[PDB]
Design a protein around this ligand. Structure first.
Ligand code: HEM
Ligand code: HEM
Ligand SMILES: CCCCCCCCO[C@@H]1O[C@H](CO)[C@@H](O)[C@H](O)[C@H]1O
Ligand SMILES: CCCCCCCCO[C@@H]1O[C@H](CO)[C@@H](O)[C@H](O)[C@H]1O
Ligand SMILES: CCOC(=O)N1CCC(Nc2cc(Cl)ccn2)CC1
Ligand SMILES: CCOC(=O)N1CCC(Nc2cc(Cl)ccn2)CC1
Ligand SMILES: C[C@H](O)[C@H](O)[C@@H]1CNc2nc(N)[nH]c(=O)c2N1
Ligand SMILES: C[C@H](O)[C@H](O)[C@@H]1CNc2nc(N)[nH]c(=O)c2N1
Lengths: 413, 413
């Protein structure tokens, strides 16, 4: 009938029915499980599969109005059916598309900022045609979203997949990201995690600048053709330099980070249609930068240097110096964004926000797909309320899937 | 053929084959899923099910020797078969039992201290018969394990389930635990989480002492008879008073905690046999006390008071005061145990230990059942290496299962 969900922090009990609308050794801590990956195609969607999903979506959309529009609903259902018989696919009204993007966001089990789901700017680039036009669209997005520090969530929808042989794809994981260099002296400079992709950019012509914070170029693929490299205009990239409210030596660390967190390589699945190119963004949550970017050993790995600067016993694990360090780094991050007037949210505030939202979600539609493993911040887990909340993780539709890294499935022309 | 497992911190790849030997909406963050709970019975184990499992276990046991003892192996296999036809069950040699307890530990997906798996003291109480004898056995365990601060892991195995109507059961979750009182003024005193169980003890005759740290009594059930209450001799309970290495006011908080972490209510399943009563213990990991016991809002909830004592902006979430506080509490815990010479391990050291162990496990037997959600410490998640490790969670055998709270399935005499 329904699944029982408990919050061991408040004793609160919830009944999840929503999971019934889901799609598909316990593969728990798997980053990219096949279940979350929507791969390629070389043939249109079998009409037998498409129409059902289409009908399905159209019904969801029309059922979403406080006061139904049955005439339009039926008309639309017909219009779409007829459109598929005659063309073998179909086009969403801008409204449906808008609705689709917010719901897909609403259904992201791994997103903690979903209380903002209804607040999204949608850029319709479905009529796009060249890499250059893609690049221009992306720039418009970046400029709009950055909003000079007062960040705004937005998404840019490019042409939907047709036959699977003319896919629009951004080869970058994020719109804004730093390059990683394997120096001569054997050391790594910049973002150790982007070493390969940085090399690719070079291989495609991009000129490496060997800096610690060089913004990588956009590698765009349009109409399924080979990817073209485009440097992002520097004026468009807002950055925050890191300062600590108390340790003046913190700035001596010479760190900074971009203000725009934009996911660039995911596919939007909606009513049977697939959009291989739909970059989107929200605003940063402090821990992403202060903890993951700066403290992961396979990224900027600055934890020990900050430890020493603080005079901690960096040689004694049980001294808990790592916990002391990372917190000061987190404080610097938050302090700097605030000082420079760039939207950002701390993880504590983020957690309570999500709890409020999940609460809203169960009341509203009897569920909220949640991936505990991703929703719990990388530091101070049980100090946040999300940690004590049991969660159900399932895949609804619309949905935002991962895709196979393009350079792995692209037939070069 | 095998599952692929990745460590995004080191790029390391592992192949899990062990999962093939496993037994049985994604029920991820569920504390007590049915899959981990081995419930009651009112009839012996169907011989058709028992023998296969028995044969199975005996083969594992004998295959564990560096140099096989095939004669004994076959003899034992026969001895056991014949023993079941004639009695409808069987007895493990002390050795097998010992082997069984370490393997079950070895197979606990939620245990981070498993690198210590082969170091376990086994107390054979399978011939026990009365609650009083149970109580004495438990005391011996407590005394031995406490070892005056130099904690020793140990387990006490009581009589295996026969027909399911004569179950030996400890009604307590842990051997040592504090009571919780609903005061007249409406406030809670002690461990808010043990309110109900404290009431039960009272209901069964125990005299409430209304203290903040009153050790609850043992509530023992023997041969399936009604539970008897036994106070634990105070001399047997070692405790650590909390002091901070720098904040002298910390001790003014008047906190302490028991040194022995002993799980009392789990069932040991081995070769078809079930042991409803097998309390066991290891030693504490700092975060259990400093974070969960002291900082969970539904437990001692001391986070805000420590925040104020430190002079932090306890009114501004984004100030990250909670992170500053909990760390100092964690430091106090570790500092106090060390000062008082009571074994304890910090979570950072614990994490590296487990990683080393998991490494050993994949090499040794091609796998290691791990529950990421439980293995990652309640604070500084990604600062520990366990966070960046993909893990497979499955149920092998021997295994330690949860059981239905006894007071829910007991027919009072
Ligand atoms: C408005 C502010 C927003 C905040 C603060 C927020 C925060 C977060 C955080 C902290 C993550 C973790 C990412 C990681 O660990 O790699 C995340 C993931 C995610 N968010 Fe949000 N988000 C916001 C807006 C959005 C928007 C506008 C969308 C979509 C239109 C969205 C879609 C997702 C998805 C799909 C993921 C999963 C990414 C992945 O699996 O790699 N988020 N978000
Ligand atoms: C030698 C030191 C040991 C350490 C430091 C260690 C540490 C831990 C920790 C931190 C937990 C988390 C408990 C919770 O969050 O509630 C745990 C759980 C567990 N440990 Fe260990 N452990 C040790 C020994 C043992 C021994 C001797 C056994 C069995 C003979 C064992 C069996 C388990 C089991 C089954 C759980 C799961 C408990 C549950 O699900 O409630 N551990 N251990
Ligand atoms: C396969 C084609 C099936 C067509 C059936 C359409 C039934 C109309 O469905 C209606 O949509 C309304 C939204 O406007 C809702 O308010 C109604 O509750 C719902 O019954
Ligand atoms: C149902 C009864 C089946 C009995 C078959 C027993 C086969 C013996 O099994 C043997 O056990 C040894 C351990 O001493 C191992 O070293 C051997 O590799 C293994 O083949
Ligand atoms: C490893 C570099 O990471 C990034 O560039 N990131 C981190 C992962 C993503 N983070 C996000 C995304 C969104 Cl849409 C909102 C908040 N944070 C995008 C930005
Ligand atoms: C809520 C009170 O918690 C406890 O009494 N605990 C916490 C849970 C258990 N912790 C353990 C158990 C073992 Cl066997 C080893 C280390 N820690 C037993 C002690
Ligand atoms: C292996 C493990 O799943 C992985 O390293 C983690 C876990 N949870 C996460 N949570 C978030 N938000 N982001 C991440 O990248 C990860 N990665
Ligand atoms: C709901 C959630 O699973 C639960 O609160 C957590 C998660 N992980 C845990 N991890 C450990 N070690 N111990 C716990 O009690 C819990 N509880």
């Amino acid at each position: 009938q329904y699944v029982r969900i408990k919050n061991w922090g408040s004793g609160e009990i919830l009944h999840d029915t929503l999971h019934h609308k889901a799609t598909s050794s316990c593969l728990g801590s798997i980053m990219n499980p096949k279940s979350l990956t929507r791969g390629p195609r070389d043939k249109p969607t079998p009409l037998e599969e498409l129409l059902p999903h289409a009908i399905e979506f159209i019904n969801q959309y029309y059922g979403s109005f406080k006061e139904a529009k049955i005439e339009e609903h039926l008309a639309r259902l017909e219009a779409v059916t007829k459109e598929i018989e005659t063309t073998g696919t179909y086009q969403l009204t801008l409204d449906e598309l808008i609705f689709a993007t917010k719901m897909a966001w609403r259904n992201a089990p791994r997103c903690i900022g979903r209380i903002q789901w209804s607040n999204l700017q949608v850029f319709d680039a479905r009529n796009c045609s060249t890499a250059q036009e893609m690049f221009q669209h992306i720039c418009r997005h970046i400029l709009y979203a950055t909003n000079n520090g007062n960040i705004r969530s937005a998404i840019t929808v490019f042409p939907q997949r047709s036959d699977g042989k003319h896919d629009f794809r951004l080869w970058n994981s994020q719109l804004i990201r730093y390059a990683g260099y394997q120096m001569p002296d054997g050391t790594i400079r910049g973002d150790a995690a982007t070493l390969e992709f940085t090399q690719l950019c070079i291989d495609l012509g991009w000129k490496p600048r060997y800096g610690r914070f060089d913004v990588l170029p956009l590698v765009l693929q349009a109409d399924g053709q080979d990817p073209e490299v485009f440097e992002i205009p520097p004026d468009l990239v807002l950055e925050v330099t890191m300062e600590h409210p108390k340790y003046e030596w913190f700035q001596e660390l010479g760190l900074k980070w971009y203000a725009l967190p934009a996911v660039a390589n995911m596919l939007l699945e909606v009513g049977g249609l697939e959009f291989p190119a739909c970059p989107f963004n929200g605003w940063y949550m402090g821990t992403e930068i202060g903890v993951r970017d700066f403290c992961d050993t396979q990224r900027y790995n600055i934890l020990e240097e900050v430890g020493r600067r603080m005079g901690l016993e960096t040689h004694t694990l049980a001294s808990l110096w790592k916990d002391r360090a990372v917190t000061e780094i987190n404080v610097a991050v938050l302090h700097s964004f605030q000082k420079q007037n760039v939207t950002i949210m701390d993880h504590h505030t983020a957690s309570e926000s999500f709890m409020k939202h999940m609460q809203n979600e169960y009341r509203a539609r009897g569920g909220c797909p949640a991936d505990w493993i991703w929703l719990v911040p990388p530091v101070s887990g049980s100090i946040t309320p999300v940690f004590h909340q049991e969660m159900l993780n399932y895949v609804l539709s619309p949905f935002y899937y991962y895709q196979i890294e393009p350079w792995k499935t692209h037939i070069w022309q």
